[PDB]
Amino acid sequence: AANKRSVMTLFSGPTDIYSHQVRIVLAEKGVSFEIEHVEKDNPPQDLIDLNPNQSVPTLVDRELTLWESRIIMEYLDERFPHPPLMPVYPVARGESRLYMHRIEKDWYTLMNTIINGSASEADAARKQLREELLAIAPVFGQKPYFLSDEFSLVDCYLAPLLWRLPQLGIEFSGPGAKELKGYMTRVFERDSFLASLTEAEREMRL
């Protein structure tokens, strides 16, 4: 069937960021996975039968599917070790599990609300969004990433939500963009990102 091999099974989404957040860590460890850009109205058959909760994405490896944005990219970082993506000290480790919770519950609602919100909210959210992302400017001077030398998962929660910057109508404004805009030159063109990006999500780059 689906898990009949030692291979994965990922009923990913071609636009939904859960796929694109997963695929970065999914491919950043150099593993042979299967991509299936599929829709909500009509995904593939296996994505609905063995998936009794029916989310996107959905990874299946010889025992059962694993559906979440967190449970997936955690299952891979704890089973495929090298290179590593999360620190060792449990003090500064779970806090690295905190920014991911202060983004999926802080900067996610500013994406859905701009997807189903009124005309002012789309800029109101873009108001609370664009300036707030400038309130985090001086961070990048100290650390080459989000307060961590190594490329860790807390950075992967940003770039897929920094790759949809103007795709939902956003552009920077103010003093100090050269610190963050120059920072985007350091993350947006990595092997973990370059080979991982979905071409459908690229055309909003020009």
Task: Between 93 and 143, name the residue whose CB sits nearer to a copy of itself.
Answer: 93
Instruction: Report which secondary-structure segment, H or E, holds 110.
Output: helix 109-116
If DSSP codes are grouped into helix, strand and coil, which group holds residue 59? strand
Of the candidate residues 7, 27, 35, 184, the single one contacting other proteins (CB under 8 A): 7
Using CB distances below 5 to 8 A depending on partner kind, what does residue 74 bind out of other proteins, a copy of itself, none? a copy of itself
Residue 52 interacting with other proteins (CB under 8 A): yes
Of the candidate residues 4, 79, 82, 178, the single one contacting a copy of itself (CB under 8 A): 79
**DSSP label at residue 185:** T
Q: How far apart are CA 12 and CA 25, in angstroms?
A: 14
182 class by beta-carbon count within 10 Å (0-12 exposed, 13-18 middle, 19+ buried): exposed
> Among residues 48, 56, 59, 44, which one has the least CA distance to residue 8?
59
Residues 148-177 that bind other proteins (CB under 8 A): none
Of the candidate residues 30, 44, 84, 94, the single one contacting a copy of itself (CB under 8 A): 94
**Contact criterion met (CB below 8 Å) for 130 and 172:** yes
**DSSP label at residue 194:** H
Q: How far apart are CA 88 and CA 104, in angstroms?
A: 23
Q: Dig out the tokens for 80 from the structure.
A: 């495929």
Q: Calculate the CA dihedral of residues 6, 9, 14, 20 and round it to 10 degrees.
A: -70
Residue 78 interacting with a copy of itself (CB under 8 A): yes
Residue 1 interacting with other proteins (CB under 8 A): no
Residues 54-83 that bind other proteins (CB under 8 A): 78-83
Using CB distances below 5 to 8 A depending on partner kind, what does residue 97 bind out of a copy of itself, other proteins, none? a copy of itself
Using CB distances below 5 to 8 A depending on partner kind, what does residue 135 bind out of other proteins, a copy of itself, none? other proteins
Q: Using CB under 8 A, list all residues that contact a copy of itself.
A: 63-64, 66-68, 70-71, 74-75, 78-79, 90-91, 93-95, 97-98, 101
Q: Using CB under 8 A, list all residues that contact other proteins.
A: 6-7, 30, 32, 52, 78-84, 88-91, 93, 99, 102, 132, 135-136, 138-139, 142, 147
